[PDB]
Amino acid sequence: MLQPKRTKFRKMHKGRNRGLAQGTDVSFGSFGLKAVGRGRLTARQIEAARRAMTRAVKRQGKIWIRVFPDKPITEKPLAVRMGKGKGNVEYWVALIQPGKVLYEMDGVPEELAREAFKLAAAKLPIKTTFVTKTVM
Amino acid sequence: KTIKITQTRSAIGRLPKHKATLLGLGLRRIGHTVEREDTPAIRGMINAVSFMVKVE
Amino acid sequence: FTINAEVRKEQGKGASRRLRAANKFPAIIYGGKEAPLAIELDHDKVMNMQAKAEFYSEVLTIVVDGKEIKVKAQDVQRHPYKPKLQHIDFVR
Amino acid sequence: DKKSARIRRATRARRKLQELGATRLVVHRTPRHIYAQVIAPNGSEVLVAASTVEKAIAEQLKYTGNKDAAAAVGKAVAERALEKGIKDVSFDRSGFQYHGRVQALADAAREAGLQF
Amino acid sequence: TRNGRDSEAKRLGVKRFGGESVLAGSIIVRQRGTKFHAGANVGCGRDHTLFAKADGKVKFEVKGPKNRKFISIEA
RNA sequence: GUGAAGAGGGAAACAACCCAGACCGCCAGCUAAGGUCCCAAAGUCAUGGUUAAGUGGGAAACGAUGUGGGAAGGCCCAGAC
RNA sequence: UCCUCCUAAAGAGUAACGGAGGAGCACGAAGGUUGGCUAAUCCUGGUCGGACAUCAGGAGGUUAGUGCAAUGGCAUAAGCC
RNA sequence: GCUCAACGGAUAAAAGGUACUCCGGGGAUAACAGGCUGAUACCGCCCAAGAGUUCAUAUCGACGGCGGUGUUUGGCACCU
RNA sequence: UGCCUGGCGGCCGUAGCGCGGUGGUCCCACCUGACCCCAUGCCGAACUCAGAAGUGAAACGCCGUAGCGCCGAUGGUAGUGUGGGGUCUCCCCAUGCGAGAGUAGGGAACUGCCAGGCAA
Ligand SMILES: [Mg+2]
Ligand SMILES: [Mg+2]
Ligand SMILES: [Mg+2]
Ligand SMILES: [Mg+2]
Ligand SMILES: [Mg+2]
Ligand SMILES: [Mg+2]
Ligand SMILES: [Mg+2]
Ligand SMILES: [Mg+2]
Ligand SMILES: [Mg+2]
Ligand SMILES: [Mg+2]
Ligand SMILES: [Mg+2]
Ligand SMILES: [Mg+2]
Ligand SMILES: [Mg+2]
Ligand SMILES: [Mg+2]
Ligand SMILES: [Mg+2]
Ligand SMILES: [Mg+2]
Ligand SMILES: [Mg+2]
Ligand SMILES: [Mg+2]
Ligand SMILES: [Mg+2]
Ligand SMILES: [Mg+2]
Ligand SMILES: [Mg+2]
Ligand SMILES: [Mg+2]
Ligand SMILES: [Mg+2]
Numbered sequence: 087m088l089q090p091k092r093t094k095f096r097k098m099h100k101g102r103n104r105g106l107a108q109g110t111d112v113s114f115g116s117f118g119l120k121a122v123g124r125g126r127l128t129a130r131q132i133e134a135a136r137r138a139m140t141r142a143v144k145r146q147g148k149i150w151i152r153v154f155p156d157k158p159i160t161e162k163p164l165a166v167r168m169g170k171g172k173g174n175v176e177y178w179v180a181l182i183q184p185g186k187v188l189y190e191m192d193g194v195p196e197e198l199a200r201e202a203f204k205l206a207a208a209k210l211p212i213k214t215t216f217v218t219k220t221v222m
Numbered sequence: 223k224t225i226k227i228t229q230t231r232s233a234i235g236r237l238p239k240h241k242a243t244l245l246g247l248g249l250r251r252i253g254h255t256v257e258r259e260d261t262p263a264i265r266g267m268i269n270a271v272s273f274m275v276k277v278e
Numbered sequence: 279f280t281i282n283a284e285v286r287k288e289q290g291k292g293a294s295r296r297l298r299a300a301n302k303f304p305a306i307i308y309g310g311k312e313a314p315l316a317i318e319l320d321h322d323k324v325m326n327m328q329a330k331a332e333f334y335s336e337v338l339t340i341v342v343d344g345k346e347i348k349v350k351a352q353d354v355q356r357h358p359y360k361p362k363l364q365h366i367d368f369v370r
Numbered sequence: 371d372k373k374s375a376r377i378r379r380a381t382r383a384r385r386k387l388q389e390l391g392a393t394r395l396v397v398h399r400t401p402r403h404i405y406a407q408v409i410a411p412n413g414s415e416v417l418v419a420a421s422t423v424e425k426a427i428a429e430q431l432k433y434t435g436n437k438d439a440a441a442a443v444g445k446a447v448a449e450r451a452l453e454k455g456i457k458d459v460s461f462d463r464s465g466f467q468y469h470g471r472v473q474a475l476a477d478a479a480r481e482a483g484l485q486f
Numbered sequence: 487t488r489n490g491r492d493s494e495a496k497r498l499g500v501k502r503f504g505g506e507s508v509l510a511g512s513i514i515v516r517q518r519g520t521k522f523h524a525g526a527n528v529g530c531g532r533d534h535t536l537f538a539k540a541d542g543k544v545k546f547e548v549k550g551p552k553n554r555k556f557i558s559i560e561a
Numbered sequence: 562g563u564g565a566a567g568a569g570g571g572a573a574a575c576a577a578c579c580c581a582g583a584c585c586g587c588c589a590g591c592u593a594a595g596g597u598c599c600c601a602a603a604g605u606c607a608u609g610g611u612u613a614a615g616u617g618g619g620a621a622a623c624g625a626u627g628u629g630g631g632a633a634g635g636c637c638c639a640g641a642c
Numbered sequence: 643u644c645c646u647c648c649u650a651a652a653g654a655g656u657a658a659c660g661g662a663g664g665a666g667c668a669c670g671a672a673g674g675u676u677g678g679c680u681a682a683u684c685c686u687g688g689u690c691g692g693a694c695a696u697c698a699g700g701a702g703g704u705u706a707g708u709g710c711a712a713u714g715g716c717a718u719a720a721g722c723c
Numbered sequence: 724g725c726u727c728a729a730c731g732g733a734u735a736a737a738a739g740g741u742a743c744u745c746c747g748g749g750g751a752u753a754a755c756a757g758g759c760u761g762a763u764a765c766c767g768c769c770c771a772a773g774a775g776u777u778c779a780u781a782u783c784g785a786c787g788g789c790g791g792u793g794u795u796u797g798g799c800a801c802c803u
Numbered sequence: 804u805g806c807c808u809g810g811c812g813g814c815c816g817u818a819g820c821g822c823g824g825u826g827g828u829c830c831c832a833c834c835u836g837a838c839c840c841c842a843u844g845c846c847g848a849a850c851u852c853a854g855a856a857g858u859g860a861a862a863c864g865c866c867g868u869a870g871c872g873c874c875g876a877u878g879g880u881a882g883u884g885u886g887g888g889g890u891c892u893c894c895c896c897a898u899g900c901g902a903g904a905g906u907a908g909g910g911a912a913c914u915g916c917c918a919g920g921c922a923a
């Protein structure tokens with residue numbers, strides 16, 4: 087389960103997931119899973135999607151994960167009032183804008199590629215699409 | 223050379239700036255044919271409230 | 279690898295989007311001692327032309343107002359998620 | 371590297387002095403020879419200049435780079451400066467420690483007539 | 487909760503901007519560290535405060551080898 | 562910005578949404594938002610398409626020879642599906 | 643109560659039992675001024691001496707230092723004798 | 724000469740109980756019920772690693788996801 | 804008149820680094836020694852003084868080099884002021900303004916005041 091190995095600060099502001107992503111081109115591998123919709127992936131969902139990917143393509147086929155959470159989400163305990171400090175950190179999330187390449191993959195056919203990403207895409211909350219690396 | 227300005231909308235839920243700009247143009251109420259000489263300023267004042275005015 | 283392309287007159291965000299939402303898109307030609315020239319062109323053709331690898335290597339003879347300009351595709355701006363082109367940078 | 375160490379040593383006095391808008395007497399001591407020149411408050415044009423490099427000065431003197439020469443330069447600055455129409459200036463030692471040749475120049479300058 | 491403390495705000499920054507006429511003694515910039523530097527007819531107080539040393543207009547400039555914002559006055 | 566302290570028209574009804582600021586009168590006309598088959602003032606108005614679900618007239622992941630549009634590449638007269 | 647940063651929407655100001663930290667002093671040298679010096683951290687060599695004491699050079703260049711938090715500052719040094 | 728630090732300092736000097744209570748007020752502010760919300764709860768679905776002699780989809784269904792209801796524990800404090 | 808140096812600037816990286824050479828007629832730089840003036844918290848290394856045998860080795864200055872740093876359009880993109888609209892945790896349209904990043908290219912500088920010496 088992915089998490090930042092130490093940080094400056096414990097608790098972070100909510101912010102606003104807005105605009106468009108930068109990691110748009112498939113950089114390392116041949117294929118990849120691009121996020122069409124807007125949202126935010128948890129540390130659990132990324133792991134859960136990676137497990138389902140890795141298992142679909144066996145020992146073979148190298149995988150890369152482009153996203154990383156690094157934004158702590160707080161939660162108030164049940165049966166507690168408003169105020170009195172900020173809530174404790176429960177899980178970590180990456181904010182995902184349209185055109186963020188989530189996962190990449192290399193060393194497989196396009197036939198067996200799509201079937202791996204279809205399993206992963208079901209684990210994720212975001213609406214996604216398959217993408218291919220192009221020469222410029 | 224003169225330019226006939228007219229007001230074509232209310233000045234109620236507008237910004238202080240836009241309530242002022244009409245006061246500068248001399249547009250008191252809707253349906254008011256005013257005539258001002260053409261300058262770089264006045265066209266800026268029209269342009270600033272382009273939505274609520276008309277040129278003739 | 280011939281493409282018939284038009285010269286632009288309107289340009290800016292307002293123009294570029296009105297263009298880009300009409301099965302066309304903006305591009306530009308530059309390089310050498312000559313002046314840089316802005317281009318309007320069809321989407322559907324250039325979308326199919328870039329299927330082959332030769333598009334990102336070989337010389338392209340772009341037809342403008344009769345004259346054939348010899349260029350190479352230097353850079354391209356992809357649309358964030360949809361499979362489509364926003365802009366092309368042709369070099370002479 | 372001496373030069374760069376001598377410049378940053380001399381910068382404080384320069385920046386301090388040019389801010390007031392003072393007509394400054396700059397000096398540059400060399401191991402052999404010595405230079406002196408009065409610069410305008412703007413810091414651009416030289417009003418008066420003098421050194422042992424001039425043959426009129428060098429033919430009279432025995433050696434070009436000592437106290438009794440630097441005094442003769444310091445006198446020659448003062449004798450010109452009064453003819454040009456200058457009197458009140460400010461001494462800028464320019465990194466060189468005020469003690470020997472520069473002091474012999476300054477003393478000879480203020481003994482002759484120049485006012486600082 | 488080990489938080490909820492903050493100091494009184496200071497009212498720092500620029501008070502007189504480019505071209506504005508100032509009187510001898512008027513504060514131009516009131517800052518902490520010398521972000522702006524004293525030029526012609528400007529002094530620096532013990533609080534690192536840039537104030538007019540003569541009547542005239544404010545001139546903001548950028549000069550020096552290390553490239554710093556100097557404030558100056560010309561009558 | 563509005564209400565509070567601003568009535569009037571519209572959003573079925575609806576302080577704060579949209580339109581617009583009520584000095585008083587008139588069985589005058591032109592307009593705003595919103596509308597125009599009947600309740601209820603005004604287009605069963607004209608031109609070319611879409612939908613067949615009462616969608617319109619609550620909603621998601623996801624599902625599917627539902628249906629309407631352009632653009633390329635696969636195969637034929639050695640006769641393909 | 644006071645101080646620093648963020649919240650605070652590029653002048654100032656700006657709330658919450660919002661997010662992180664500090665102060666209730668210290669100093670006749672740690673003030674004044676005049677003259678001169680420039681750091682961290684590595685590398686190689688060298689007695690006891692080791693990863694690290696002191697010495698020498700070279701690379702790096704201000705990643706140091708600033709009586710005490712953080713911010714903004716400082717080579718003309720506000721740093722160090 | 725004041726941790727007058729409850730730091731614009733009420734006095735030089737000050738802790739508790741009330742179910743024995745009382746008066747003045749408040750839905751400016753809680754308990755009951757209603758409302759708004761739905762984290763939680765309960766009810767569904769999506770994906771399918773496995774269980775199921777073999778065989779994911781008879782019955783199950785991890786890792787995760789998307790909804791519905793207003794039946795729980797709550798939040799808010801808009802009505803009294 | 805030019806060719807060179809020196810100080811003093813101005814301009815603050817198209818101006819700075821790493822390479823490639825080159826200057827000693829003067830000029831500056833090491834250099835030369837240390838009754839002395841002054842100097843070291845040990846030391847003439849530093850500052851200082853007295854100098855004129857050497858080399859331009861270090862440093863510097865100049866010439867050439869893109870191997871770097873730096874500068875940098877046009878076009879697009881994000882953002883956004885004003886007025887609308889939607890499928891309203893975000894977008895779209897008109898109308899201004901319009902980046903950063905990136906690309907083609909440019910690019911190892913450029914000029915004022917005096918002072919010397921060589922060909923005139
Ligand atoms: Mg309005
Ligand atoms: Mg423009
Ligand atoms: Mg505050
Ligand atoms: Mg303060
Ligand atoms: Mg009231
Ligand atoms: Mg009506
Ligand atoms: Mg009605
Ligand atoms: Mg209501
Ligand atoms: Mg609204
Ligand atoms: Mg409207
Ligand atoms: Mg109706
Ligand atoms: Mg009725
Ligand atoms: Mg009717
Ligand atoms: Mg502010
Ligand atoms: Mg502001
Ligand atoms: Mg506060
Ligand atoms: Mg000093
Ligand atoms: Mg001090
Ligand atoms: Mg108080
Ligand atoms: Mg107070
Ligand atoms: Mg009892
Ligand atoms: Mg009683
Ligand atoms: Mg009672």
Ligand SMILES: [Mg+2]
Nearest residue numbers: 750752800801
């Ligand atoms: Mg209440």
Ligand SMILES: [Mg+2]
Nearest residue numbers: 750751801802
């Ligand atoms: Mg009430």
Ligand SMILES: [Mg+2]
Nearest residue numbers: 749751752800
């Ligand atoms: Mg209250």
Ligand SMILES: [Mg+2]
Nearest residue numbers: 749751752800
């Ligand atoms: Mg209260």
Ligand SMILES: [Mg+2]
Nearest residue numbers: 755756757800
């Ligand atoms: Mg209740």
Ligand SMILES: [Mg+2]
Nearest residue numbers: 757758793794
């Ligand atoms: Mg209920």
Ligand SMILES: [Mg+2]
Nearest residue numbers: 758793797798
């Ligand atoms: Mg309840």
Ligand SMILES: [Mg+2]
Nearest residue numbers: 752753799800
């Ligand atoms: Mg309450």
Ligand SMILES: [Mg+2]
Nearest residue numbers: 751799800801
């Ligand atoms: Mg309230």
Ligand SMILES: [Mg+2]
Nearest residue numbers: 757758802803
């Ligand atoms: Mg009730």
Ligand SMILES: [Mg+2]
Nearest residue numbers: 859860861862
């Ligand atoms: Mg050499």
Ligand SMILES: [Mg+2]
Nearest residue numbers: 877878879902
């Ligand atoms: Mg641009």
Ligand SMILES: [Mg+2]
Nearest residue numbers: 875902903904
């Ligand atoms: Mg740019």
